Amino acid sequence: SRVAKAPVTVPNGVTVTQNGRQVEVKGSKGTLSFNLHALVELKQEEGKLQLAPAKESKDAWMQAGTARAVLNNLVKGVSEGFERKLQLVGVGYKAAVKGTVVNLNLGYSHPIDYALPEGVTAETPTATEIILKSANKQLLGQVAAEIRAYRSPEPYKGKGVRYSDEVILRKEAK
RNA sequence: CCUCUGGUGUACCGGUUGUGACGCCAGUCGCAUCGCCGGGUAGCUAUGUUCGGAAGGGAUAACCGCUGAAAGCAUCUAAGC
Numbered sequence: 001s002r003v004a005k006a007p008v009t010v011p012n013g014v015t016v017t018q019n020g021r022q023v024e025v026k027g028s029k030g031t032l033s034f035n036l037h038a039l040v041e042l043k044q045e046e047g048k049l050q051l052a053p054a055k056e057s058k059d060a061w062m063q064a065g066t067a068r069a070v071l072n073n074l075v076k077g078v079s080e081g082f083e084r085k086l087q088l089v090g091v092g093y094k095a096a097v098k099g100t101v102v103n104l105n106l107g108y109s110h111p112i113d114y115a116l117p118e119g120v121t122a123e124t125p126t127a128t129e130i131i132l133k134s135a136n137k138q139l140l141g142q143v144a145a146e147i148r149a150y151r152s153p154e155p156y157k158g159k160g161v162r163y164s165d166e167v168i169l170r171k172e173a174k
Numbered sequence: 175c176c177u178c179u180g181g182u183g184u185a186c187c188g189g190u191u192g193u194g195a196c197g198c199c200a201g202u203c204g205c206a207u208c209g210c211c212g213g214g215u216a217g218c219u220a221u222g223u224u225c226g227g228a229a230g231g232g233a234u235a236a237c238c239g240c241u242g243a244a245a246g247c248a249u250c251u252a253a254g255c
Contacts, residue, residue: 002246037253058244059252066243066253073241138241138255145240152238 004064008072010047011079016071018042023071027078029135030119034070037063042071049075077135084144086130090159093151094127102130106151106161114150117143 053060153160
């Protein structure tokens with residue numbers, strides 16, 4: 001596996017520790033923990049990191065590749081972090097943030113109140129845009145997915161919640 | 175379930191035909207589908223009255239995902255959620 005063979009770099013300030021199988025990643029953003037498969041072994045030499053199979057099985061190579069990908073994502077997130085960005089399209093559609101809660105109007109008979117999970121923060125420079133930032137890429141993706149599922153876009157006029165870099169199929173009636 | 179609206183209510187009250195009897199008048203009783211007719215207490219009852227199928231958890235079906243390699247890309251799946 002090219003991924004599993006490629007190593008990852010610990011930039012300056014993040015410490016990665018291990019006990020049993022539970023790898024832990026520490027930095028400015030916060031703690032991030034990742035369990036490890038039985039067929040995968042981890043070698044920490046200098047600032048670089050190396051995942052390697054414990055046997056020659058293709059399954060072991062697969063587990064090594066996914067473990068390296070997830071650990072690289074964690075190392076990148078704990079130092080820099082990720083943000084997603086969300087756009088709203090349609091008249092009367094609006095968003096606001098009151099601390100940990102997002103208040104949304106999407107053309108229903110009642111406004112929607114979404115609680116944000118711990119670790120994800122949101123900002124609203126404008127009623128049309130939302131910015132979501134977190135250190136956990138999976139959590140950020142899940143929260144963005146739920147917000148989009150509240151009103152997914154439609155193809156005739158493109159109204160609804162959309163990702164920033166999302167291509168939306170457009171058609172024309174009759 | 176029987177407070178209300180009704181039905182039934184042959185041991186409750188009354189009107190009335192024929193006949194026989196209680197010595198006779200008066201007053202009563204037997205029999206005639208409870209003789210026939212008009213009402214009707216409890217109980218039972220519907221066509222009457224009240225109530226019920228409310229709300230909430232947990233695991234899922236089709237389906238929709240997050241992150242993610244095998245397969246440097248992509249991918250809901252193989253680890254995980």
